Every structure is written in C-alpha cells, then in structure tokens.
Amino acid sequence: ATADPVKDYLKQIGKVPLLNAEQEVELAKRIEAGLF
C-alpha cells in the first residue's frame, strides 16, 4: 500500500519457487490428474 502501485504489485509477487523441468512436468501431471 504505497504510491506507484506497481511497486506494491511487484512486492506482492514476492518470492515464489521457480520451476525446473521435472517440477513443472510433474505439476502438469497432477494438473491433468485433477482434470480427469
């Protein structure tokens, strides 16, 4: 909550885990599992 709201948006992104190959392929696997 500050002026120039884009800065607060970038902070709201914060620190989140970037996904390496096996990570996102497994994530997609259980994504389609939940899909079915």
1-24 per-residue burial string, b: 16 or more CB within 10 A, e: under 16: eeeeeeeeeeeeeeeeeeeeeeee
In the complex with DNA, the residue whose CB is nearer, 10 or 29, is 10
Report the interface residues with DNA, using CB under 7 A: 4, 6-7, 9-10, 13-15, 18-19
Least distance from DNA to the Cβ atom of residue 9, Å = 7
In the complex with DNA, the residue whose CB is nearer, 19 or 29, is 19
d(C-alpha 2, C-alpha 8), whole Å:
7
Least distance from DNA to the Cβ atom of residue 36, Å = 21
Q: Which residue has the tokens 């970037």?
A: 18
